[PDB]
């Protein structure tokens, strides 16, 4: 069975089950009719199952590639959802295993039923539905159908945007003004015929395009009230645009959003936000490129102990560095005056200043250069879900030197230019630094 | 007071006290005569004291330099030992503060007496000596006279080498064969009139030079029997040679040697040794460039908690990388097949294999690429003492894939070439990644 | 089946499999030929299996013996390797269970194949070998064939000595000069016709005997360069000599060496080395007999938590004490002036002095008397592997009293040797129940 064939059968089996489930739900709601146990046990409401086998024999397999590899011979399977949404991804991944290892692809109904909430009111019916309907050999991919549907639903909820509009290159900010600037620059790019950017999905619903009646409707103020972490997508025909998510504040929220965004398998996400500068030689407006993180955020301690080192992705580091040279003033070694590369402390205690003594030893021990509340969490999540990551913050205050609580446009530009550099980079973006011993074949 | 003047007064006060102490000791040994309390209380056996003051006013001070900087106005002092041995260092450091800040230098006797053992019997004398003789602002430097004398004495003991022969660029190895190769290459370089290398200090005493009668006396086999960590110095006229220390095995020993070597203020130390490859795609003989460390060595947990991130020094990382391209085969992106960049696990349990299950979770969580017993320790110590560091290991076995327990020359060459690249690098070697908030002015 | 019979069948089955494996390896290397799955599944490359059963019925079994006992009825099994090397041991152990409990012995092929590396080319073969060949009830013994072969190979590597030269009485030292003194005394004993010592296996290869051409070749200086922990064996006809291992420095190394030496089932191992004296009344050259250890070595925390008490073996303690009286002058309570019995601190931080304050509280809390870097580790390992242990250190410095870093070396080593003698004559009184676990394997 081939890639194109596998995709088509997945679409078929999936479409069939969702329709069969929607059908049964309608029947129950109108005539209190229930589905037959036999049909269900036969895959009536089941997710498609994708299996890929490898015999182990191959001339010279990709020993250096970061993804799309086999660590051993055997069968790798996974339930699948929304094949259309994941068409590109699934195609590309299956193609790599097909052409580089001559793997045996096969599709068939799984043993897992689709929870009815994902195929769609009242509350009395809620009692019956949950009673008679579905509610809530190595891994071929990181997440299974259940986990993916779970996160897609949630993404829309926190983002106020359809998941089909998310681009592979993500930018995260903890400062509102950045989206204003992003949207402005975005609309501007859409009007330029030479720019690949043809649309702008906005949190709330707005869909700005070149044929739009007064693109002022871009930023809906009501967006921040109904969505915890509003997103904005600058789309391109080939889906290689830029997504910007205003994550808000705190490690808790940073963890939450990454938990979901991870299922879309981004190519990279960068943290472009504010931070407090801890060094006297630092000036408000300066940049900090994190080369390491002092994880005082707690939120991920249980799944990733604080002593597990979270490294820097060299490719992303150069990108941020180079992009900073270009956009910010003249290049050379002069950047040093405006850019500091060092360790960033991420805390879950905004008011850490009320306890400086207790913190001072840590800052000193870590040679801390800046402090924020999202960096380490985003980076750690990137690391956990094999999503290249990077952090370039901008000093907005100097807590330790009597300057507690513009460069916005420039800062955002550095982020965007970095994206550009990484996009052209092609596959050099992905390395083996994030690969696990039991790494799934799919990227 | 000027740099040259300060150095001269330091030499004087120091020379005087050591002679005065040596004198008093001889008098006691021969005639049981004791020193007079008044003279001592007047600085008879005291170390010289170096004080540097800064008013705070200066046009535009070095805001980007890694060392020789003032974080605030005030006086910085420190006791000093062996001014001749530290002549270059002290001169350079004082010149920087003198010319860039117009700092006020001053020398005077301290309140600290030189422990008699450092200026050099039955149980009867030792009893008297320790009874009647000395026994064992902001800081201007990292270590004080007592701490420095303590380490110099120890360095000679573990190394079997005079401290005056140590060079600024250090190489560490946990494999004996590396010194054989190093000495061979070393003697070879001494015979070449175009090579800056003019001498080779050897563990045990040997001093090979171009005018030597059969330089076969180089490696004294008795060296490993009388010295725990034998060193070899390839010296140059300007003292910019290469020092190689065979550290032996274990985190304990790695910690010990660095504790002392740190007082000589090296420019950099690289770990060039063996390790176990943890990945199936790794082949014996491949190289591992550490970008992070999983500190399971324990030995430094109390002074530097395992959650404090130990970063990579970019400059050292590139030098190790480039040096690997040059020396090892052809350049390009092909290095990837021979070189893996990733996280190294340093353990204090050589037989960790006897407990794979317990370890496996850690290896996986850290994306471990290799495992040794000294790396993280050496790097952590470098970090602690502000000594740029780096690690480039060579896979000598594959514990997880059966194969358990020429390239040596190549490996060593990579280390040496890296040193060369860093030496030419000049000051770009030192960055601010290791600076503390209360960083002493002296490098 | 009887002891002698079991030994013979073990030798047979083992010899057969090793030869069968060596054969298959040769075939692959020369003709790329692979073994047949059926033969292997039939015990072609398999280790012998030793099983001992007990019905539970017996007049009056040894209720006080430290080893060779049954806690309950049932079958006890274990894979076995190098039956020749372990002939004495295996025979003695099987004899005890046979005659004291009338146990049912039986030998047969196991389900475990011998990893090819233990029966010993190039690099392009390593890939194939590891692909087509074997790579790297209740237990009858502490270690199985896999674990034993693993350690034997390693012992030779760290020691620079063939495993069959190791004696039951082991001495550990962290000071080079002790081997010089040991070898000297050793050669001397070999020349004396009244001494049971007939040979001296040396690290590196040398095999000194009475018929040797200038026994100066004893200590090969190159030994410390090619072997991390050089050993020296003073052998006797009945293999009851003394083995000396120069372990070097650190808890890591102390742990490593004991991990391997334990499979040879020593009768005892003593730590005879230097330490720092922490008491003002202590004089350089004094002795310290450890009655307890403050484990600040870390290296064994995971498998043996620091709060599990590591006790002193009374028999070993008396031997060390008496030996000290004899060798170090006259007996009586006059030893007190030269010998202090107390708690020893074992750390993995040689430069602990750089943090005295942080340590002071601990030293004080434990009534610490000395500090070193190997004792607690050696002792803990002995405890873990049921190998009687003891520590008698010699103060080489006084870190806390201005005396920071030999005739006494010879005396110290003599105390160690005399202690061994006392323990050797002690017979079985050496082994007690203080090290027995609830699920203790029948074999010593
Ligand atoms: N001195 C400081 N301490 C902690 N967090 C921050 C920040 C960042 O700014 C945000 C905090 O916002 P407020 O400064 O409005 O409380 C956080 O998302 C955090 O990443 N800037 N300066 C900081
Ligand atoms: N699989 C492994 N596990 C732990 N350490 C090592 C080493 C290294 O090898 C040395 C240990 O030597 P041996 O392999 O001779 O015991 C240590 O210095 C350590 O850094 N190589 N392979 C290793
Ligand atoms: N004051 C002290 N602190 C720690 N270890 C030791 C030792 C022992 O001496 C050895 C250390 O050697 P060096 O004293 O040459 O560094 C270790 O094996 C250790 O057991 N002697 N004195 C010591």
CB count in 10 Å sphere of residue B275: 27
Whether A16 and A113 share a structural domain: yes
Question: Can you read off the two tokens belonging to residue A279?
Answer: 């060094």
Instruction: Report how many helices (DSSP H) and strands (DSSP E) chain C contains, helices first.
Output: 12, 15
Largest CA distance in chain A: 75
Q: The CATH number of the domain where C215 resides is what?
A: 3.40.50.1580
Q: How many residues does chain C have?
A: 444
C227 touches chain B (CB under 8 A): no
Q: Mapping DSSP to helix (H, G, I), strand (E, B) and coil, where does residue B10 land?
A: helix
CB A51 within 8 A of CB A97: no
Rounded CA-CA distance B103/B3 in Å is 10
The total number of structural domains that make up chain A: 2
Torsion, Cα of A201, A203, A206, A210 (10° steps): -30
CB B242 within 8 A of CB B416: yes
Looking at B119-250, list the stretches that DSSP marks H as alpha helix, in order from N- to C-terminal side. Answer: 123-132, 145-159, 177-191, 223-226
Whether C130 and C161 share a structural domain: no
* Closest ligand (CA of A178): 1
Rounded CA-CA distance A237/A198 in Å is 7
Lookup result for tokens 């003599």: C414
DSSP A354-390: GGHHHHHHHHHHHTEEEEESSHHHHHHHHHHTT--EE
B292: closest CA of chain A, how far (Å): 6
Domain membership of residue A17 as a residue range: 1-141
Whether B131 and B268 share a structural domain: no
Q: What is the resolution of this structure in A?
A: 2.6
Rounded CA-CA distance A388/A262 in Å is 11
Q: How far is the CA of A350 from the centre of ligand 1 (A)?
A: 6
Rounded CA-CA distance C360/C209 in Å is 51
Rounded CA-CA distance B430/B433 in Å is 8
Domain end call among B111, B141, B171: B141
| Non-local CB neighbours of B381 within 8 Å, separated by 6+ positions | B254, B255, B258, B259, B262, B300, B387, B389
Evaluate the CA torsion angle B184, B186, B187, B192 in order and state its sign.
Answer: positive
CB B389 within 8 A of CB B270: yes
Closest residue in chain B to residue A367, using alpha carbons only: B436
Q: Is B71 exposed, middle or buried (0-12, 13-18, 19+ CB in 10 A)?
A: middle
User: Is C403 in contact with B348 (Cβ distance < 8 A)?
Assistant: no
**Which of C252, C283, C360 is the best substitution to test chain B (most B C-beta atoms within 10 A)?**
C252
Whether A360 and A290 share a structural domain: yes
User: Is C130 in contact with B401 (Cβ distance < 8 A)?
Assistant: yes
CB B160 within 8 A of CB B223: yes
| Non-local CB neighbours of B225 within 8 Å, separated by 6+ positions | C176, C221, C223, C224
* Closest ligand (CA of C275): 3
User: Is B253 in contact with C250 (Cβ distance < 8 A)?
Assistant: yes
Lookup result for tokens 């929607």: A22
User: Is B366 in contact with A308 (Cβ distance < 8 A)?
Assistant: yes
Question: Can you read off the two tokens belonging to residue A340?
Answer: 């500091």
Rounded CA-CA distance A187/A202 in Å is 11
| Non-local CB neighbours of A32 within 8 Å, separated by 6+ positions | A128
Rounded CA-CA distance B128/B119 in Å is 17
Give the β-pairing of B389-397 and B274-277: parallel
Q: Is A90 exposed, middle or buried (0-12, 13-18, 19+ CB in 10 A)?
A: buried
Whether B231 and B291 share a structural domain: yes
Residues of C in contact with B302 (CB under 8 A): 355, 358
Q: How far is CA A419 from CA A50, A159, A195, A399, C174, in A?
A: 32, 21, 15, 31, 58
Radius of gyration of chain B (CA): 24
Domain end call among C82, C115, C141: C141
* Closest ligand (CA of C272): 3
Q: How far is the CA of C396 from the centre of ligand 3 (A)?
A: 8
**Residue of A399, A410, A390 lying closest to A285 (CA atoms):** A410
Residues in A 382-441 with any Cβ partner in B closer than 8 A: 431-438
Closest residue in chain B to residue C286, using alpha carbons only: B123
Whether B121 and B151 share a structural domain: no
Lookup result for tokens 């800052």: A363
Instruction: Kindly list the strands in the beta sheet with C74-79, ordered across the sheet, starting from the edge strand earlier in the chain.
Output: C104-113, C46-54, C74-79, C138-139
Mutate to test the pocket of ligand 1, among A275, A376, A393, A394 (most ligand atoms within 8 A of CB): A275
Taking CA atoms only, the protein residue closest to ligand 2 atom 16 is B350
Rounded CA-CA distance B110/A389 in Å is 52
The rounded Cα A432 to chain-centroid distance in angstroms is: 19
**Which of B74, B307, B380, B382 is the best substitution to test chain A (most A C-beta atoms within 10 A)?**
B307
Looking at C32-105, list the stretches that DSSP marks H as alpha helix, in order from N- to C-terminal side. Answer: 37-40, 87-101
The number of C-alpha atoms within 13 Å of A44 and in the hemisphere containing its C-beta is 16
Whether A272 and A229 share a structural domain: yes
Q: How far is the CA of A434 from the centre of ligand 1 (A)?
A: 29
Lookup result for tokens 């790396």: B375
Rounded CA-CA distance A345/A352 in Å is 11
B132 touches chain C (CB under 8 A): no
CB B54 within 8 A of CB B24: no
Q: How far is the CA of C37 from the centre of ligand 1 (A)?
A: 66
Of B314, B343, B365, the CB nearest to A311: B343
Evaluate the CA torsion angle B141, B143, B149, B152 in order and state its sign.
Answer: negative
Q: How far is CA C82 from CA A69, C11, C52, in A?
A: 42, 8, 19
The number of C-alpha atoms within 13 Å of C50 and in the hemisphere containing its C-beta is 32
Rounded CA-CA distance A278/B437 in Å is 9
Whether B156 and B112 share a structural domain: no
Lookup result for tokens 């910690």: B255
Element (H or E) spanning C110, and its range? strand C104-113
* Closest ligand (CA of A345): 1
Question: Can you read off the two tokens belonging to residue A197?
Answer: 């950017």
Whether A123 and A149 share a structural domain: no
Rounded CA-CA distance A404/A397 in Å is 5
Domain end call among B120, B141, B162: B141
CB B367 within 8 A of CB A436: yes
Angle between helices B251-261 and C251-261 (to 10 degrees): 160
User: Is B259 in contact with C117 (Cβ distance < 8 A)?
Assistant: no
Residues in C 163-182 with any Cβ partner in B closer than 8 A: 176
Rounded CA-CA distance A110/A45 in Å is 10
Which residues are paired to A295 by β-bridges?
Answer: A346
CB B329 within 8 A of CB B338: yes
CB C165 within 8 A of CB C236: no
CB C252 within 8 A of CB B251: yes
Rounded CA-CA distance B282/A435 in Å is 14
Residue-wise burial string across C197-234, b where 16 or more C-beta atoms lie within 10 A, e elsewhere:
bebbbbbbebebeeebeebeebbbeebbbbbbbbbbbb
Whether C338 and C248 share a structural domain: yes
Rounded CA-CA distance A134/A113 in Å is 6
| Non-local CB neighbours of C17 within 8 Å, separated by 6+ positions | C43, C44, C45, C46, C47, C48, C109, C114
B326 touches chain A (CB under 8 A): no
| Non-local CB neighbours of C242 within 8 Å, separated by 6+ positions | C167, C169, C170, C171, C233, C234, C417, C420
Rounded CA-CA distance A99/A91 in Å is 12
C259 touches chain B (CB under 8 A): yes
Lookup result for tokens 């082991």: C170
Residues of C in contact with B284 (CB under 8 A): 123, 126
CB A399 within 8 A of CB A353: yes
The rounded Cα A181 to chain-centroid distance in angstroms is: 21
Question: Can you read off the two tokens belonging to residue C383?
Answer: 């405890």
Rounded CA-CA distance A315/A333 in Å is 19
Q: How far is the CA of C254 from the centre of ligand 2 (A)?
A: 15
CB C443 within 8 A of CB C74: no
Rounded CA-CA distance C39/B261 in Å is 60
Whether C119 and C148 share a structural domain: no
Which residues are paired to B271 by β-bridges?
Answer: B172, B391
Rounded CA-CA distance B297/B302 in Å is 12
Rounded CA-CA distance B370/A389 in Å is 23
Taking CA atoms only, the protein residue closest to ligand 3 atom 16 is C350
Whether B135 and B157 share a structural domain: no
Q: The CATH number of the domain where A100 resides is what?
A: 3.30.1730.10
């Amino acid at each position: 069975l081939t890639p194109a064939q596998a995709l088509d059968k997945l679409d078929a089996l999936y479409e069939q089950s969702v329709v069969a489930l929607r059908n049964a739900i309608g029947n129950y709601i109108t005539s209190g009719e229930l589905p037959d146990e036999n049909a269900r046990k036969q895959g009536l409401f089941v997710y498609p199952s994708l299996t890929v086998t490898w015999d182990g024999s191959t001339t010279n397999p990709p020993k250096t590639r970061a993804f799309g590899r086999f660590t051993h011979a055997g069968s790798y399977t996974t339930t699948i959802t929304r094949p259309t949404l994941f068409r590109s991804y699934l195609n590309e991944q299956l193609t790599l295993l097909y052409q580089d290892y001559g793997a045996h692809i096969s599709v068939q109904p799984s043993q897992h039923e689709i929870p009815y909430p994902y195929v769609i009111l009242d509350r009395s019916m809620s009692a019956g539905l949950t009673r008679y309907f579905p509610t809530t050999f190595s891994p071929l991919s990181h997440f299974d159908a259940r986990r993916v549907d779970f996160s897609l639903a949630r993404l829309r909820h926190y983002t106020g945007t359809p998941v089909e509009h998310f681009q592979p290159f993500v930018l995260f900010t903890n400062y509102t003004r950045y989206v204003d600037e992003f949207v402005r620059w975005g609309c501007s790019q859409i009007l330029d015929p030479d720019s690949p950017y043809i649309a702008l999905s906005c949190a709330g619903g707005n869909w700005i395009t070149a044929e739009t009646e007064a693109p002022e409707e871009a930023i809906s103020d009501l967006a921040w009230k109904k969505h915890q972490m509003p997103a904005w997508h600058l789309i391109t025909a080939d889906g290689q645009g830029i997504t910007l998510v205003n994550i808000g504040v705190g490690p808790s929220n940073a963890k939450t959003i990454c938990d979901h965004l991870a299922v879309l398998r981004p190519d990279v996400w960068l943290m472009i936000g504010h931070c407090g500068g801890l060094r006297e030689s630092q000036a408000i407006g300066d940049y900090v490129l994190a080369h390491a993180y002092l994880r005082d955020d707690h939120v991920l301690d249980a799944v990733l102990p604080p002593d597990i080192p979270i490294p820097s992705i060299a490719e992303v580091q150069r990108a941020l560095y180079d992009a900073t040279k270009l956009v910010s003033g003249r290049p050379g070694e002069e950047v040093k005056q405006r850019l500091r590369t060092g360790t960033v402390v991420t805390t879950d205690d905004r008011n850490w200043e009320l306890r400086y003594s207790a913190s001072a030893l840590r800052f000193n021990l870590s040679r801390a250069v800046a402090i924020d509340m999202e960096s380490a969490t985003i980076a750690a999540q990137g690391y956990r879900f094999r999503v290249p990551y990077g952090t370039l913050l901008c000093v907005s205050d100097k807590p330790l030197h009597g300057e507690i609580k513009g460069a916005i446009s420039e800062h955002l530009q550095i982020g965007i230019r970095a994206i550009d550099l990484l996009r052209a980079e092609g596959d050099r973006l992905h390395s083996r630094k994030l690969r696990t011993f039991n790494e799934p074949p799919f990227r």
